[PDB]
Ligand binder design. Structure first.
Ligand SMILES: CCCCCCCCCCCCCCCCCC(=O)OC[C@H](COP(=O)([O-])OCC[N+](C)(C)C)OC(=O)CCCCCCCCCCCCCCCCC
Ligand SMILES: CCCCCCCCCCCCCCCCCC(=O)OC[C@H](COP(=O)([O-])OCC[N+](C)(C)C)OC(=O)CCCCCCCCCCCCCCCCC
Ligand SMILES: [Zn+2]
Lengths: 57, 52, 446, 95, 49, 58
C-alpha cells in the first residue's frame, strides 16, 4: 500500500496498493514469448563476448 | 537601450567567456598572419624565417 | 530559533554493531510507535552467471510462500494476524525483504525475518505456479514502457557484462529453472557477511541486537568451497538501441553517460546538476514560469509529455542522464534542447542556478527520509554500499562545498565530448542517428 | 588488435600447470618457498613433509652462521640437530 | 519479453582496448578520441594548406 | 597522466584549442612541406635547373 522501489533514483518511493503489493497483474494466462530473428546469423553471446583469437590454435 | 544586461549574472557569464573568446581571437590573429604572410610577426618566429 | 545546521545535527545517530557471523546490525530510534525492520542482502542480477539469470527474482517470489517451520499461508496468516506489512524488492545489486510493523511486536517480526532469509521451503508445485506468475508479470512489465527503456539502456550500455541482464532475466530461464539451481544461488549469495539487518523507528538497539543474536545467529558464515564471488568492473559501451513500433502513441527515449558510482564524492555535485534540470510532466501546475530552462522551453514549444533526469550508481559505475516521453514530431528538437542544457552546465553555469540546485538537493535529501521505510532503506543500502551510514549533516557539509566552478568542471568531466548510450522505444525515426547525438554532446564554440 | 595472446591458466600443462594450480591455492609441494612453523620444542617439532621415509634436513640453527648442519631424517621419532637442539619430525604423506 | 532482447557480439568491429568486458572504460577513451581527432586535425591542416 | 590522455585534454578537447592547433600546424607544415618538396624536386633535376647553373654566368 505504501512503498514501491522505483523512480530511476533507486528509491523506495510511494505507490498505490494495486501496484506496490500486487505487481503481477490480474491477466490470467501468459500469452507467448515471440522469438527474435536477425538478418545475418549473429553470435549474440552474453558471457565473455563470444571468442577472442586470430587464427588456428 | 542595452540596460537589460546590467547584473551579476551577465558579469559572471562575461568572466566565464573571457578565455574562450580570447583564444578564438588568438586563433583569428594567427590565421590572419598565417594567410597574409605578414612580415611583422613572421620575422619574430624562428623556423618560419627560412625564405627571407 | 534553530537554523539548518542545528536541526541537521539534532537528527538521532544510527548505531551499527557486528555479530560473530559478520551480520551487520544497524538501527536508529525516533518517537514513532511503529517500526520498519528489514534484511538487505548483497545479491542481485550482477552476481548471476547467465544460466541462473532469474534466480534472485524467483527466490524473491518464493520467499513468502512458506518456510520449514511455517508451511505456506500460515506464515502469511501470522503477519496478517499482527497487521504488519511485508514487502520486498530485487535490484541488479541488492535484494531487500522489509516489514513495516508496530514497535511493540519487535521480537516476532525478527523471528519471521530470520527464516525468510535462511529456511525457505522451496516446493515443486510452488515453483511451477510462481514460474507462471513471473511469466505473467514480465508480460505486465512489458506494458510499463519506461521500464522497457530502462532495461534496454542497461543492456546497450553494459553489453557483454553481468550488468546488462535484467533482474527477472529471459523467458527461457523462467521456463527451465530447477530447484537445485535456486539452492546453489541461495547457498552462494545468502551468507551472513553480506547481510545488513536494518531497523528504523521506535526500536531499542540493544533489544534488536539481542533478537539478532537469538534468531539470526549462524546464518551461513561458510563459503563451502572457499570461493568468494567477487565483483568485476564493467565496460561501458557508447551505443544505440532502437526498438521501433509505430503503433504506440508515445515514444520513450533515454540518453545516458557514465557516472562514477557510490563511493566518489562528486556524485553530490552531479546530483546538484540534476536538480538544475529536474523533472516535468504534463500535470505540473507552474505554467511558463518554471525555473528549469528545459521545462520552460518544452512548455512553451509544447514538446514533451514528460522528462526526468537520473543518476544511477553501482559498484564503481553508473548511468547518468535523462529520459523523456513525447510524441514523434517533437523528439529531435528535445534532444537538441536537452544536449544544449548539458553543454550550458559544462560551460556557463552561474551561481544562482547552483544555489537553487543546492536548495533542491537539500530538500530532496531531507524530505526523502520521512517515515521509517525510506530511513531503513537508507540505512541498509548505505551499510551495503558506502560501508557506513552517511549522516545528513555530512550530506549538508558536502552540498555546501559545491560552487559553480567545480560544478562546471565536474559536468565537463562527465558530459562534455563523451559518447552517450541511447535507448528508444516507440515512433522514433525522428530520433536522430548516433552521429548527430554524439556531435550534439560538444559545442564548436566551447 | 584482437585477443589471441592466451592467458596462462589454459596453456599451462604439466609441472608448470600443477605448480601454478597449487600455488594459487597457497600450497607449495615442490619446494619453491622456505617453509614455516619453526618450533624446536620437544612436544612441537619442526614438521617436514616427505614422499619417502628419508630426507635431507639442514639446520642453520643459530642466525648468521657459516655452516648448515646436514643430516638424514628418517620416519619415526623426532631427533634433533646434533649440536643445537632444534627438533625435526618427518611426515611421509606428501606425494 | 523485452528482457529477451540481447545485444549481439560486436567484437570483430570493436577497437582493441575496449575488447574485454571485465576492464572498465574511461581509462583509454581519451586515447581513442585523441586518435580520431588527430585524424581530423591532420585532414584540416592539409586542406588548409 | 599518460601522454595520449593529456594530448587529448590540452589540445583536442576544446574546439578553440583544436583550431589553434590546426593553425600552428598549418604554418609549420607549410614550411616543412615546402622545404621537402623543393629538395625532392631539385634532387630529381640535379644540374638541370637554372639555380644549379646560375653560378657559371655570375
Ligand atoms: C575538409 C576536412 C575538414 C572538414 C571540417 C572538419 O572536420 O572540421 C573539424 C571540426 C569538426 O570535425 P569533428 O566532427 O571531428 O569535430 C571535432 C570535435 N572536437 C572539436 C571536440 C575535437 O571543426 C572545427 O574544428 C571547426 C572548423 C575550423 C577548424 C580550424 C581552422 C583553423 C584555421 C583557420 C584559418
Ligand atoms: C658522446 C656524445 C654523445 C652525444 C652527442 C650529441 C651530438 C652528436 C652530433 C649530432 C649531429 C650533428 C649534426 C646535425 C646537423 C647537420 C646539419 C646539416 O648538415 O644539415 C644539412 C643536411 C643536408 O640538407 P638537405 O637539404 O639535404 O636536407 C633535406 C631537408 N629536408 C628534410 C627538408 C628535405 O641536412 C641534414 O643533415 C639533416 C639531417 C636530418 C636528420 C637528423 C636526425 C633525425 C632523427 C633520427 C633519429 C630518429 C629516432 C626515432
Ligand atoms: Zn641446529
Amino acid at each position: 500500500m505504501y512503498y514501491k522501489f522505483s523512480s530511476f533514483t533507486q528509491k523506495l518511493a510511494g505507490a498505490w496498493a494495486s501496484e506496490a503489493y500486487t505487481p503481477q497483474g490480474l491477466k490470467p494466462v501468459s500469452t507467448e514469448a515471440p522469438p527474435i530473428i536477425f538478418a545475418t546469423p549473429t553470435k549474440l553471446t552474453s558471457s565473455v563476448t563470444a571468442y577472442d583469437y586470430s587464427g588456428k590454435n | 537601450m542595452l540596460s537589460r544586461f546590467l547584473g551579476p549574472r551577465y558579469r559572471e557569464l562575461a568572466r566565464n567567456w573571457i578565455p574562450t573568446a580570447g583564444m578564438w581571437g588568438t586563433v583569428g590573429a594567427v590565421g590572419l598572419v598565417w594567410a597574409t604572410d605578414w612580415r611583422l610577426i613572421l620575422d619574430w618566429v624562428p623556423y618560419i624565417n627560412g625564405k627571407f | 530559533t534553530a537554523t539548518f545546521a542545528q536541526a541537521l545535527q539534532s537528527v538521532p545517530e544510527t548505531q551499527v554493531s557486528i555479530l560473530d557471523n559478520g551480520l551487520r546490525v544497524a538501527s536508529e530510534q525516533s518517537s514513532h510507535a511503529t517500526c520498519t525492520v528489514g534484511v538487505w542482502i548483497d545479491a542481485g542480477s550482477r552476481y548471476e552467471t547467465e544460466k541462473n539469470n532469474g534466480a534472485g527474482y524467483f527466490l524473491e517470489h518464493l520467499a513468502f510462500k512458506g518456510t520449514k517451520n511455517r508451511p505456506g499461508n500460515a506464515l502469511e496468516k501470522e503477519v496478517e494476524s499482527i497487521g504488519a506489512h511485508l514487502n520486498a524488492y530485487s535490484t541488479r545489486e541488492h535484494t531487500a525483504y522489509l516489514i513495516k510493523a508496530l514497535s511493540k511486536d519487535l521480537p516476532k517480526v525478527v523471528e519471521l525475518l530470520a527464516d525468510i532469509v535462511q529456511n525457505s521451503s522451496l516446493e515443486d508445485s510452488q515453483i511451477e505456479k510462481e514460474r507462471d506468475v513471473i511469466l505473467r508479470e514480465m508480460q505486465e512489465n512489458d506494458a510499463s514502457m519506461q521500464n522497457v527503456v530502462f532495461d534496454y539502456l542497461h543492456a546497450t550500455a553494459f553489453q557483454g557484462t553481468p550488468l546488462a541482464q535484467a533482474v527477472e532475466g529471459p523467458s527461457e530461464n523462467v521456463r527451465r529453472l530447477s530447484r537445485t539451481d535456486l539452492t546453489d544461488y541461495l547457498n552462494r549469495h545468502y551468507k551472513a557477511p553480506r547481510m545488513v539487518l536494518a531497523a528504523a523507528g521506535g526500536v531499542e538497539h540493544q533489544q534488536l541486537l539481542d533478537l539478532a543474536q537469538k534468531h539470526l545467529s549462524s546464518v551461513s558464515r561458510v563459503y563451502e568451497e572457499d570461493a568468494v564471488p567477487g565483483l568485476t568492473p564493467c565496460r561501458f559501451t557508447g551505443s544505440e538501441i532502437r526498438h521501433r513500433d509505430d503503433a504506440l502513441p508515445l515514444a520513450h527515449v533515454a540518453i545516458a553517460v557514465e557516472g562514477p558510482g557510490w563511493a566518489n564524492p562528486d556524485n553530490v555535485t552531479l546530483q546538484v546538476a540534476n536538480a538544475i534540470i529536474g523533472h516535468y510532466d504534463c500535470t505540473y501546475g507552474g505554467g511558463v514560469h518554471l525555473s528549469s530552462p528545459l521545462a520552460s522551453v518544452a512548455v512553451a514549444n509544447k514538446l514533451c509529455q514528460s522528462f526526468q533526469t537520473f543518476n544511477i550508481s553501482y559498484s564503481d559505475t553508473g548511468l547518468l542522464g535523462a529520459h523523456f516521453v513525447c510524441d514523434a514530431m517533437s523528439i529531435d528538437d528535445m534532444v537538441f534542447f536537452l544536449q544544449g542544457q548539458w553543454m550550458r552546465l559544462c560551460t556557463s553555469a552561474t551561481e544562482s542556478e547552483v544555489t537553487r540546485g543546492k536548495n533542491i538537493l537539500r530538500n530532496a535529501l531531507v524530505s526523502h527520509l520521512d517515515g521509517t521505510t525510506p530511513v531503513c532503506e537508507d540505512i541498509g543500502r548505505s551499510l551495503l554500499t558506502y560501508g557506513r551510514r552517511i549522516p545528513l549533516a555530512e550530506w549538508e557539509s558536502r552540498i555546501q562545498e559545491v560552487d559553480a566552478q567545480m560544478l562546471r568542471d565536474i559536468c565537463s568531466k562527465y558530459f562534455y565530448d563523451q559518447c552517450p548510450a541511447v535507448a528508444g522505444y516507440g515512433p522514433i525515426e525522428q530520433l536522430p542517428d548516433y552521429n548527430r547525438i554524439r556531435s550534439g554532446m560538444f559545442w564548436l564554440r566551447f | 588488435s584482437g585477443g589471441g595472446v592466451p592467458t596462462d591458466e589454459e596453456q599451462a600443462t604439466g609441472l608448470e600447470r600443477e605448480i601454478m594450480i597449487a600455488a594459487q591455492k597457497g600450497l607449495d609441494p615442490y619446494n619453491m618457498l622456505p617453509p614455516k612453523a619453526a618450533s624446536g620444542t620437544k612436544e612441537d617439532p619442526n614438521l617436514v613433509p616427505s614422499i619417502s621415509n628419508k630426507r635431507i634436513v639442514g639446520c642453520i640453527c643459530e642466525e648468521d652462521n657459516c655452516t648448515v648442519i646436514w643430516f638424514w631424517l628418517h620416519k619415526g621419532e623426532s631427533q634433533r640437530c646434533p649440536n643445537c637442539g632444534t627438533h625435526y619430525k618427518l611426515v611421509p604423506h606428501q606425494m | 519479453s523485452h528482457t529477451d532482447v540481447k545485444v549481439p557480439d560486436f567484437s570483430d568491429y570493436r577497437r582493441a582496448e575496449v575488447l574485454d568486458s571485465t576492464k572498465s572504460s574511461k581509462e583509454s577513451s581519451e586515447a581513442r578520441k585523441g586518435f580520431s581527432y588527430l585524424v581530423t586535425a591532420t585532414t584540416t591542416v592539409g586542406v588548409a594548406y | 597522466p599518460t601522454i595520449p590522455s593529456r594530448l587529448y585534454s590540452l589540445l583536442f578537447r576544446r574546439t578553440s584549442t583544436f583550431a589553434l592547433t590546426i593553425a600552428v600546424g598549418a604554418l609549420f607544415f607549410e614550411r616543412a612541406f615546402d622545404q621537402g618538396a623543393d629538395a625532392i624536386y631539385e634532387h630529381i633535376n640535379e644540374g638541370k635547373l637554372w639555380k644549379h647553373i646560375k653560378h657559371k654566368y655570375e
